[PDB]
Design a protein around this ligand. Structure first.
Ligand code: A1H5U
Ligand code: GDP
Ligand code: MG
Length: 166
C-alpha cells in the first residue's frame, strides 16, 4: 500500500474538531455537525511529492478510541481562540495523550480555531507560549474560511515524519 498516517483530532466540546475535519475532506464548512458523532475518515493526499492516505479519528462523546489512542501517530490539540476554557483544557488533553503513549515524545500540533470570529479571548502570544512549552508547532485556523486547515494537517504529517520513518 501507499503511505498511511493515523491522526487523532482532540479537544474540548465545540472547538471545531468536526468542522476542521469536514473542511479538510469536503472543502465546505458545517454549521452544526452532531457533537456526538465519533467516526474515522480517510483522505488520499499528496504532501511533498508523497501520496498518502490519512486515517483521521474525529473524537466525540470505546475499543476504537482505545485502539486509535494506542496506535494513532499524531494529534491535533484543538482549542477555539474565543473559548478560554477550551484553551485551558489543552493541558488535560495533552496529559491523556502522554498517559497512553507513556511518552513525552508524541507528534502533536496545537491548533487555535475560529480565527474568523472577532470575540478573541486567547491571544496569539498565549498560544505560542503554550506550544513552545510543549515543543510543538502552533497553527491558527478557521474551519469557516478554511484558513490554516491544510497547514495544520500537513504540519502534523511532517511532525510524524520527523519522529519516525514512514
Ligand atoms: C462536544 C463533546 C466533545 O467534543 N467532547 C470532547 C471530547 C471528545 N471529550 C472527552 N471528554 C473527557 O472527559 N476526556 C476525553 N479524553 C479523551 C478524548 Cl479523545 C475525549 C475526551 C482522550 C484523549 F484525548 C487522549 C487519550 C485518552 F485516553 C482519552 O480519553 C480518556 C477518557 O476521557 C478523559 C479522561 C480524562 N480527562 C478527560 C478530559 C480531557 C478532562 C477525558 C468529550 C466531550 C467533552
Ligand atoms: N465561525 C466559526 N465557527 C466554527 C468554526 N469551527 C467550528 N465552528 C462552529 O462551532 C460549533 C462547534 O463546531 P464542531 O466542529 O461541531 O465542534 P466539535 O465539538 O469540536 O466537533 C459549530 O456550530 C460550528 O459550526 C470556525 O472556524 N469558525
Ligand atoms: Mg464533533
Amino acid at each position: 500500500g501507499m503511505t498511511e498516517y493515523k491522526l487523532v483530532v482532540v479537544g474540548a466540546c465545540g472547538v471545531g474538531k468536526s468542522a476542521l475535519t469536514i473542511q479538510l475532506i469536503q472543502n465546505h464548512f458545517v454549521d452544526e455537525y452532531d457533537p456526538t458523532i465519533e467516526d474515522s475518515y480517510r483522505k488520499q493526499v499528496v504532501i511533498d511529492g508523497e501520496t498518502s492516505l490519512l486515517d483521521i479519528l474525529d473524537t466525540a462523546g470505546s475499543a476504537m478510541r482505545d485502539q486509535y489512542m494506542r496506535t494513532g501517530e499524531g494529534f491535533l490539540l484543538v482549542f477555539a481562540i474565543n473559548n478560554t476554557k477550551s484553551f485551558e483544557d489543552i493541558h488535560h488533553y495533552r496529559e491523556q495523550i502522554k498517559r497512553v503513549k507513556d511518552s513525552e515524545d508524541v507528534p502533536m500540533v496545537l491548533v487555535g480555531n475560529k480565527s474568523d470570529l472577532p470575540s478573541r479571548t486567547v491571544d496569539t502570544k498565549q498560544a505560542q507560549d503554550l506550544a513552545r512549552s510543549y515543543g510543538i508547532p502552533f497553527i491558527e485556523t478557521s474551519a469557516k474560511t478554511r484558513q490554516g486547515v491544510d497547514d495544520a494537517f500537513y504540519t502534523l504529517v511532517r511532525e510524524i515524519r520527523k519522529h519516525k520513518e514512514k
